[PDB]
């Protein structure tokens, strides 16, 4: 009865593979070797946000370039000011160790999460002057390790019960429940059209979901280890992965196989986030061994490396104009690179 | 413009109750010491800390916090999540201490529990974290190697030519059997800390039972140990 | 994809040799420490044994200790098992697993009861 399923799994799987390798007519760097190279990007740190207590894990910027909301590990959300390094806003969080924040496409709301099994959000109206708990989310089993926000209306998690769910904010309820994954889902990016998201997780795979429809469209089983972020390309027919096996991935949704892979032997540690910029040429990859590398997404070269951190760079963000990249590493400090 | 500075001095005031409001967090932070408590289900990690403790449950970390003298200590248990557990433990790099307890008495499941040890200690990022050690539930081992039902031989074939250390200083209601197993056990898990760990992190091993009020004072010594064994790391003595 | 295939099993007598052959497809097998697991019929998963990169830093579980041989071959892609001196007990649904990441000695949960690199399983019976 297994033995059959089984042995069914395996035949579509080799006929999942046969027409990749059909569809394999040839590869991005033999089309793009009459590309002209980018050469050397030098980034400097042009404002450092300094005054977190504990790590910071993750970070989100704002459509309008200008609020960028930033979590760390002693209960803190801050959203801070990227032009006059102000802090605009310093949220107290009911657990400590918080592992994911989003903001609002229309700033009137902040997401976070954390170990506590709960999406958190907060409300910036502030009739009184104070923020406050605006809902509260309690529907996962496992840690909630990002959260997107579609609208104000719904929000996308990803949790560590292999599960990633759409919640309507003002119900408090999940719309929709993905489970497809078996290993713990790190990162999930929303696509532009916010039709389709991708979600990567610990099983070495990344899922394609439709999100009205409910179900996985695509699986991507290009990488070797755990698939620690995933960020679409901007057109949205691609998206880029960074594992702890020192790669990073490009794969085409419409190919449905990995179009690209950014390796190098000097590497061996994890790249904690990937973000790719606004025209999609620089795939920016935060790693492990305490620098950022600027990869050419069409020429698989580095071009330049922003070692300006102490320790682990957790989380790496980019502008939708493109101005700037903050990077926040696990050094308590947060740097803003152009 | 005098609007722009208007906005502009908001801002800036804003600014400064945020940073007067994280001076006051500041202080509160450095006052405590987060432990990360790691265990089993059969263990009872629940209970090592008895006496002079407030115990707050969120909906998917308990804690514990307690003050022995004059110092706060901030106990996090993890214990509503899925097994896969290599992925949240990076969180835990900044806690000054990882309580690791473990049933001694389950000999079947003694060398899971030296699995889970070996992990935590040989991760990248509890490098530089003291693992303070439990083994829990010692008059079990009494009962159960006095009344020679269960072989500890069979579940680990060193205890054999095993010797009882010289360092080693056996309580009064002791037996030498179970001062062998006991301390069998703790040399173990001594081996595993030792043979592959740098000089940044040390294993702190402690018996305790099911009724024992002195494990506040213990974890209160161990973390005095491991900022002054840091801070002679700094100096460069050590 | 990275896929474990194990190979071998089946029922043995007590005291038989049998060797378990796990077949490492899809990645690059130098770069990662590989560990042997088995489950036994209602007991839980327990490490049986594990090899490192290059293979000098073997250790094993006390039950196993003497009679279990761990072995890597890089340029067959392979990990063997050779058993000898089998005992009833210890029979179980042995599995292929590998630690998450490369130039690492870390395993946190290659025993757990969902974990994704890790072969269907084959069951070793001894009578």
């Known amino acids: 009865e297994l033995d059959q399923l089984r042995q069914e799994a395996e035949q579509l799987k080799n006929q999942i593979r046969d027409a990749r390798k059909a569809c394999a007519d040839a590869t991005l760097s033999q089309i793009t070797n009459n590309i002209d190279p980018v050469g050397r990007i030098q980034m400097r740190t042009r404002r450092t946000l300094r005054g977190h207590l504990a790590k910071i894990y993750a970070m989100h910027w704002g459509t309008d370039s200008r609020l960028l909301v930033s979590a760390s590990q002693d209960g803190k959300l801050i959203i801070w000011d990227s032009y006059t390094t102000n802090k605009v806003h310093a949220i107290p969080l009911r657990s400590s160790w918080v592992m994911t924040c989003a903001y609002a496409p229309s700033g009137n709301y902040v997401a976070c999460g954390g170990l506590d099994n709960i999406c958190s959000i907060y409300n910036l109206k502030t009739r009184e002057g104070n923020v406050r708990v605006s809902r509260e989310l309690a529907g996962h089993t496992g840690y909630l390790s990002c959260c997107r926000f579609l609208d104000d209306n719904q929000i996308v998690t990803s949790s560590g019960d292999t599960t990633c769910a759409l919640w309507d904010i003002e119900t408090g309820q999940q719309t929709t429940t993905f489970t497809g994954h078996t290993g713990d889902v790190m990162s999930l990016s929303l696509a532009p059209d916010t039709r389709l998201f991708v979600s990567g997780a610990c099983d070495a795979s990344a899922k394609l979901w439709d999100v009205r429809e409910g179900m996985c469209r695509q699986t991507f089983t290009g990488h070797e280890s755990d698939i620690n972020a995933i960020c679409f390309f901007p057109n949205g027919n691609a998206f880029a992965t960074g594992s702890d096996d020192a790669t990073c991935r490009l794969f085409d949704l419409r190919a449905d196989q990995e179009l690209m892979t950014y390796s190098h032997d000097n590497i061996i540690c994890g790249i904690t986030s990937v973000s790719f910029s606004k025209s999609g040429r620089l795939l920016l990859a935060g790693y492990d061994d305490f620098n950022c590398n600027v990869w050419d997404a069409l020429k698989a070269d580095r071009a330049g490396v922003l070692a300006g951190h102490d320790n682990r760079v957790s989380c790496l963000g980019v502008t939708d104009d493109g101005m700037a990249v903050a990077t926040g590493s696990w050094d308590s400090f947060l740097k803003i690179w152009n | 413009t005098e609007d722009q500075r208007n906005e502009e001095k908001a801002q800036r005031e804003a600014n400064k109750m945020i940073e007067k409001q994280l001076q006051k967090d500041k202080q509160v932070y450095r006052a405590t010491h987060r432990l990360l408590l790691l265990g089993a289900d059969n263990s009872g990690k629940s209970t090592i800390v008895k006496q002079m403790r407030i115990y707050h449950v969120n909906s998917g970390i308990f804690e514990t916090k307690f003050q022995v003298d004059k110092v706060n200590f901030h106990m996090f248990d993890v214990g509503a999540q899925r097994d896969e557990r290599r992925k949240w433990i990076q969180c835990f790099n900044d806690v000054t201490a990882i309580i690791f307890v473990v049933d001694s008495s389950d000999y079947n499941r003694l060398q899971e529990a030296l699995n889970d040890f070996k992990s935590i200690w040989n991760n990248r990022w509890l490098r530089t974290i003291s693992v303070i050690l439990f083994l829990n539930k010692q008059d079990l081992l009494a009962e159960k190697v006095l009344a020679g039902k269960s072989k500890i031989e069979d579940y680990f074939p060193e205890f054999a030519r095993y010797t009882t250390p010289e360092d080693a200083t056996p309580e009064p209601g002791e037996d030498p059997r179970v001062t062998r197993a006991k301390y069998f056990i703790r040399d173990e898990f001594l081996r595993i800390s030792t043979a592959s760990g740098d000089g940044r992190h040390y294993c702190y091993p402690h018996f305790t039972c099911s009724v024992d009020t002195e494990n506040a004072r213990r974890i209160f010594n161990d973390c005095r140990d491991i900022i002054q064994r840091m801070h002679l790391r700094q100096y460069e003595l050590l | 994809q990275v896929q474990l295939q194990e190979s071998g099993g089946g029922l043995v007598q007590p005291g038989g040799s049998l060797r378990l052959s796990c077949a490492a497809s899809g990645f690059t097998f130098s770069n990662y420490k590989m560990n042997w697991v088995r489950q036994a019929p209602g007991k839980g998963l327990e490490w049986v044994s594990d090899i490192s990169q290059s293979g000098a830093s073997i250790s094993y579980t006390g039950s196993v200790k003497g009679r279990f041989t761990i072995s890597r071959d890089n340029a067959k892609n392979t990990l063997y098992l050779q058993m000898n001196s089998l005992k009833p007990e210890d029979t179980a649904v042995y599995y292929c697993?590998?630690?998450?990441?490369?130039?690492?000695?870390?395993?946190?949960?290659?025993?757990?009861?969902?974990?994704?690199?890790r072969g269907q399983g084959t069951q070793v019976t001894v009578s």
């Open positions: 697993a590998r630690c998450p990441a490369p130039f690492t000695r870390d395993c946190f949960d290659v025993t757990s009861t969902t974990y994704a690199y």
